[PDB]
């Protein structure tokens, strides 16, 4: 058994202290990303900081689409597929900008009789997808670090 | 810049020969409009469509108003009806102002349930079972957000249109992190539920929940403890009719006050794959969770907005079994899951596989447990889930998921997909969707389990292809086939010649467009139209059918 | 006293 406990952090050492930027700093995705970063031991500086030479994580477009994945024999929708895609960038000061992305799939059955309930369900689903988007982008940070080297 | 667009035409089987005559109108830099006479021959009239797109300080929005003054087909199928006019109003508006004020509008109103089947699918779909009408005004800052919202629905189902509407709804959240070791959160809600019927329950609900959680993390381990305190007050009125028919009696005042204890733990083991591949790293992540919620009798409350949630691998660790705040089941359970990830030389995750299960110690009761499970298993290992995702190459990849239930004694839901994609113009994809009839019986309403169009379940195979020719043409096709019925569900073809000054497109689609209640078969709709406009348009054509293509990598 | 939005105004005065 070669399985050993992880000795490195999920977020690389260079990106321990970083800036977070977006046009929606008060949106659900920003909240999810900030929570994921604060859990991984990352210190977030304001964008106004005179402190230079810290990397910058700029969150970009977020698009959520609800499509019909399957239909019944009458053509009515059976499964609704929620797809969330998020684009972001990481600027390493003085070296380059590295683009990153996240995509989350989920599905749920439709129920017109309990339509209101289903709406609530959808809301909950969306609130989860943001979290999935926040852990994905972080898991892509080491790929940026290796790319910079 | 304001002038006639190039005309458009189609030949259907529901409106026969159709003709669009668009007219653009640049009213301002931020506002534009288009007036489209749409002559329909079978209905023998003109639907006047009007679109208005605007960009403002509040955000961006689109309004559509379609009006058909009179209809012959609708008149024939409803001889005794007062009028035969048809109309649709759509209003979408999303926007954030000064980074704090969030405005969302999604309104759709139609004159009759049959509108979407009988007309174009720009903002509607024949697959839709209902239309939604939501308004939302919110204020969000870093540690606070509030929102006043209105929800209304127009169900197209003739059997039971009756739906509940949350006309006022308030969602107040507050977050206070770094309160010593602990992190704190509070959620509040006030909602008034009204039904379209004059004899259904009506209720106002006030909900408050404090939350305190302690996160502790290392380089390999993460343990999080969490305590919630849910408090709900229901004031229900207009309950005579319900109590005159059902043995369970609804109360006018209900107070439900319960704690929730949750513990999450996860590890991260790592190894370096050597024989299989050089410099490839495999990660093994075990994850465990214990949840405890005591039981309260909810028989005095009508199920306004609680529905059973699907349990994927991520949903296995979700603490709620129902949505909303009406049915909160008891919980004494431990959930275990394992994830394996493969990382290549560039530290890019190329593969991951997940599998987990839920083991109950006590039955999840809610007071109104009427779910028709196929067996009587109440405790033990009851729910299983699994996911997989493989990126074989730059142009090739596949996905998969499965959920199994012992209470259904069957695989509740499954999905699979495999895609080849060089670029937006050249790609191939194959997908599969499954849903057992037992799952349909258990979760969907009672009449689903007896109706032929629903009781069989889902077993659907889809193929999508897009191949360019001579970097000017783009042949696009899609085929969806139900293997239980052995019948086509949706199929489309399309050809687009895209030059530098024009792009001609011809399309064809055959789709399921309703059920016939007499001969007990489905109605198919065919449409063949041409579109001239003044990329090869592959993605636009891929999204034109009722089962639109989605990128799977 | 009056909670006009967040109260039972469809059937309440019955
Ligand atoms: C746990 C590891 C995670 C990896 C997850 C990836 C799983 C990918 C799922 C691909 C399988 C989908 O296809 C799988 O095969 C058949 C084909 O109908 C279904 O089978 C079901 O329907 C068919 C008939 O329609 C019956 O013969 C069968 O008894 C019934 O169970 C399975 O229930 C479904 O799950
Ligand atoms: C504005 C107001 O005072 N409301 C309360 C008084 N009443 C009745 O007492 C019947 C009218 C009904 N309502 C509610 O029940 C909430 C709204 C207005």
Author numbering:
A (entry chain B): 999 to 1147
B (entry chain A): 225 to 758, 766 to 784
C (entry chain C): -1 to 12
What's written in the study?
These β-strands are connected by turns on the periplasmic side and extended loops on the extracellular face that fold over the lumen of the barrel and require rearrangement to allow LPS molecules to reach the external surface. LptE is tightly bound in the LptD β-barrel.
Binding modes were described by cryo-EM, resulting in 8 high-resolution models of SfLptDE in complex with Bicycle molecules at 4 different binding sites. Compound 12 could not be unambiguously assigned to any competition bin, but structural studies showed it to be binding in a different epitope to all other peptides tested. Interactions with Compound 12 could not be unambiguously assigned because this compound does not appear to compete with itself, which is a critical positive control. The achieved resolution allowed to resolve both the β-barrel of SfLptDE and the Bicycle molecule, showing binding of the Bicycle molecule along the outer rim of the β-barrel on the extracellular side of the protein between β-sheets 11–13. While the Bicycle molecule made specific peptide contacts with the protein, a significant portion of the molecule was embedded within the detergent micelle and did not appear to cause any significant structural rearrangement of the barrel. All Bicycle molecules across each epitope had a similar binding mode, as described for compound 12, i.e., with a protein binding face interacting with the rim of the β-barrel, and a detergent binding face. Charged residues on the Bicycle molecules were typically found facing away from the protein.
